[PDB]
DNA sequence: AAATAAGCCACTTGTTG
DNA sequence: AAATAAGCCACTTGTTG
């Protein structure tokens, strides 16, 4: 699945994790953006710094990202 | 929708809320079964005694019933 | 409206007496 | 296996600076 493709490219160093996502939600103290080789952001996925999982990101809602155990601790 | 049909029959007194669901989960101290006029249980739906909402019940998982605010307080 | 997320269910995997 | 539910996402409605 498309989830594992993204995670494989982070482990190889093809994708880098972006210092920060511009917003006001507490989730961004834990979750980060993913960058391709050309410095273009990977659309639709974010990275948890705590568990190192790749989670689906949709701008229409931040509830899945919110209730993810690593964010719910904040 | 089928959710509102069940709730309408509880408000009319056509459906009665059953004293208890046999199980070990804390959710059953708040959630109850629904009975038809002939005393046969309404399959697929449960009733919250606290908020009085009709929630979907599937025997394959109790997670939706679990994280419902009235149960999550226990 | 850009952003955030309550609050229901779907769904697969995992657990446990 | 009967029962319970972690733990991800879908999805519609509602909120708020
Ligand atoms: Zn995490
Ligand atoms: Zn309730």
Author numbering:
A (entry chain A), B (entry chain A): 4 to 77
The authors write:
The Hermes DNA transposon is a member of the eukaryotic hAT superfamily, and its transposase forms a ring-shaped tetramer of dimers. The Hermes transposase is composed of 612 amino acids and is organized in four domains. Architecturally, the Hermes transposase is unusual as it spontaneously forms a ring-shaped tetramer of dimers. All hAT transposases are predicted to contain an N-terminal BED zinc-finger domain organized around a conserved CCHH or CCHC motif that coordinates Zn2+13, but no structural information is available for Hermes as the constructs used in previous structural work lacked the first 78 amino acids.
The complex crystallized in space group P6522 with a crystallographic twofold axis perpendicular to the oligonucleotide that intersected it at its central base pair. Thus, the asymmetric unit contained one BED domain and one DNA strand of the duplex. Each BED domain contains at its C-terminal a CCHC zinc-finger involving residues C51, C54, H71, and C73 that coordinate a bound Zn2+ ion. The two BED domains bound to the imperfect palindrome do not contact each other, but each C-terminal α-helix between T65 and R70 (α3) is deeply inserted into the major groove. Key to binding the imperfect palindrome is the ability of the N67/R70 pair of the BED domain to assume alternate conformations. In the other half (BED2, shown in green), the position that was occupied by A18 is now replaced by G20, which is less competent to interact with N67. We observe that N67 is completely displaced, no longer facing the DNA but instead interacting with K59 and the phosphate of G19, with R70 now in its place to interact with G19. Thus, the structure shows that the single BED domain of the Hermes monomer is able to form specific interactions with two related but distinct DNA motifs. Therefore, only simultaneous double interaction events were observed consistent with cooperative binding. As the crystal structure of the BED/DNA complex showed no evidence of protein-protein contacts, it appears therefore, that cooperativity is the result of DNA deformation.
